[PDB]
Amino acid sequence: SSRRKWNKTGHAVRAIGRLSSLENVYIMADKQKNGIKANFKIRHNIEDGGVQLAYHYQQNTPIGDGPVLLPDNHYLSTQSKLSKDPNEKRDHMVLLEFVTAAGITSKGEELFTGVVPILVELDGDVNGHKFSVSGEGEGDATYGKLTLKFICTTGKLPVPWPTLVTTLVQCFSRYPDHMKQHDFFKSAMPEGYIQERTIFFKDDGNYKTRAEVKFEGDTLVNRIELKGIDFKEDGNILGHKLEYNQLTEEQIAEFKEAFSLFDKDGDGTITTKELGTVMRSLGQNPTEAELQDMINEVDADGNGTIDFPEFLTMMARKMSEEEIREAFRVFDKDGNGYISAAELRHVMTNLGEKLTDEEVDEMIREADIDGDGQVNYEEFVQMMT
């Protein structure tokens, strides 16, 4: 009677919470300033329990005088990952970011065709506490990939690293082909733009930032000015009560090259064409609708193809070994229970991989436990665990 009333009621309020994921920078155009505006919120997890909310308000403006692409309403989707360098004695932060544009159904772009070296210099002052951060890294707009390492050059960071994340280069965001006309950030380079932000930390102080994002050579640079005020000495920020920390770096790299098998033209995505091409090489034959449905299945944002992040979130999961036996069937074409150096070579070739004969044998040897020169099921399984 009442137990059910609590249940149904709880499930409803909880459902809202599960729907209230995201996470998303909403971009709007601002004609008055030949630029864009944006706003979003960040949930910083608190060590012990709770969530520190930070409301962001963002305004961008071209530094140069040239023409600029003013976008229609859309949003940026981003994944962050913080970690530490075991060998670093300085107060530092390692960061991995994947930004992708969505929300829709030029010259400064060729600047972001390959890997671009990044430099970030931060000068901030929170409650009279002066500090400085500097970060080196690189960006890959093709995957919306972003990897940098920041170091505090003033000693100990007065605030939690997570709070500075949003402040420490949206020009590396990954814009889909059908939205490359809404990419304000790249159409502003090399001259670059100005990024201003007010960040309100609920029940605490606020940040005010002004940054210059431009090209100082072949290097993309981010010079930032920050000012924090009204922060409580016992608050989550000055009190360092927010959690800092999920895969391994090298771990993710594995999925990177796996992804590169499908993405054969290195444009950073997997189309239904590239997908079908691969499955067909592996002796499978999906229809056009199936291909589309497969992609649409993991393409949550709805851009069109399959992004590296999507590939990533899919491959991370766990549960259901059936996929392994299924993977074994793919290798074992004749289906007799063993994987031969030939069949293994055949799979490699199909996937479009250039492995020698010493290298293939090396792979066999790495899994061939009984030494029969083959790879049976019980070894294929253990080899993948």
Give, as ranges, the residues between 325 and 364 that touch a second copy (CB under 8 A).
Answer: 325-327, 330-331, 347-348, 351, 353, 355, 359, 362-363
Does 20 bind a second copy (CB under 8 A)? Our answer is: yes
Any idea what the Cα angle at residue 46 is, between residues 42 and 47, rounded to 5°? 150
Peptide bond preceding 190 in cis form (omega within 30 of 0) = yes
Place of tokens 């996929």: 323
User: Which of 270, 328, 313 minimizes the C-alpha distance to 294?
Assistant: 270
Cβ proximity to Ca ion: between 73 and 336 the closer is 336
339 beta partners = 375
Does position 193 bind Ca ion by CB under 5 A?
no
365 touches a second copy (CB under 8 A): yes
User: Could you tell me how many residues make up the chain?
Assistant: 385
**Three-state SS at 150:** strand
322 binds a second copy (CB under 8 A): yes
Is residue 57 marked as binding?
no
Q: Please say whether the beta carbons of 272 and 289 come within 8 A.
A: no
Looking at beta carbons only, is 19 or 87 nearer to a second copy?
19
Asked if 15 interacts with a second copy (CB under 8 A), we say yes
Residue numbers 88-147 binding a second copy by CB under 8 A: 103
Q: Which one of the spans 50-58, 224-232, 299-307, 317-325 is the region binding Ca ion (CB under 5 A)? A: 299-307
Among 115, 298, 342, 369, binds a second copy (CB under 8 A): 298
Q: How far is the CB of 334 from Ca ion (least distance, A)?
A: 5
Residue with tokens 């066999």: 364
Q: Quick check: 372 binds Ca ion (CB under 5 A)?
A: yes
- Residues pairing with 83 in the sheet: 94
Residue 307 is assigned to a ligand binding site: no
| 25-30/35-45 β-pairing | antiparallel
Q: C-beta of 370: minimal distance to a second copy in Å?
A: 17
User: How many distinct helices (H) and strands (E) make up the chain?
Assistant: 11, 15
Q: Is 266 left (phi over 0), alpha (psi -120 to 50) or beta?
A: left
Does 200 bind a second copy (CB under 8 A)? Our answer is: no
Out of 165, 194, 278, 341, the only residue in the binding site for a second copy (CB under 8 A) is 278
Binding region for a second copy (CB under 8 A) out of 92-100, 170-178, 181-189, 286-294: 286-294
Site for Ca ion in 238-297 (CB under 5 A): 263, 265, 267, 269
* Binding segment toward a second copy, per CB under 8 A, in 5-13, 61-69, 81-89, 145-153: 5-13
94 CB-near residues (< 8 Å, 6+ apart)? 82, 83, 84, 85, 148, 149
